[PDB]
Amino acid sequence: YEFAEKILFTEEEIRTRIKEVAKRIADDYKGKGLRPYVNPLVLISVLKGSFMFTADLCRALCDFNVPVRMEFICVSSYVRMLLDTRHSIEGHHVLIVEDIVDTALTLNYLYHMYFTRRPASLKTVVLLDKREGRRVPFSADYVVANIPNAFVIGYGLDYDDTYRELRDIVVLRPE
């Protein structure tokens, strides 16, 4: 990548970590009675960044026979909801999917919002976690990779909406 710096995580490394995370999720929900139609694991994907992670994660979950329901939401901050879920999450096992949690301002807002809607359970899975960038305390339930305070792009992550399409996660501005 001539426009960026070193590759932080290759596609194969990301694929491998996602498979392990899906394995852990499958194990953790094994006794929850997840079933298609009535009780699938609801993946609430925060657009735009999580689209790629979501596509790969849902397939890894499928590998472990975990039935899932995909939801896509969109938010904006000046946090307001531009697009919310199409089906009620009440009584369901929900997993909010994000590409990166740094300040945790958005994710914490969404977690609070969904928590009040009476889901059976509510957890979060993030591709990347900059645990040091917090503006509000927030602990994700599943993390694919913890990273330093480096600006990264690729695999859904952007530099002003560009470079989301890269197969690898690359360092634009080091750590």
List contacts with its own copies (CB under 8 A). Answer: 3, 36-37, 40, 45, 47-48, 51-52, 54-56, 58-59, 61-63, 67-70, 72, 74, 82-83, 87, 160-167
Q: Give the whole-angstrom CA distance, residue 134 versus residue 58.
A: 27
Among ligand FMB, its own copies, none, the one that 102 touches (CB under a kind-dependent 5 to 8 A) is: ligand FMB
Q: Residue 130 Cβ, how far from ligand FMB at the closest point, in Å?
A: 6
Are residues 130 and 100 in contact, defined by beta-carbon separation less than 8 angstroms? Answer: yes
Is 56 a residue of the active site?
Answer: no
The answer to whether residue 100 forms part of the interface with ligand FMB (CB under 6 A) is yes
Judge residue 66's burial from the number of C-beta atoms within 10 Å of its C-beta, 0-12 exposed, 13-18 middle, 19 or more buried.
buried
Site string for ligand FMB, 49-88 (x = CB under 6 A): ----------------------------------------
What is the enclosing helix (H) or strand (E) of 125? strand 121-129
Among its own copies, ligand FMB, none, the one that 40 touches (CB under a kind-dependent 5 to 8 A) is: its own copies
| Alpha helix stretches (DSSP H) within 64-147 | 105-115
Q: Over the Cα atoms of the chain, what is R_g?
A: 16
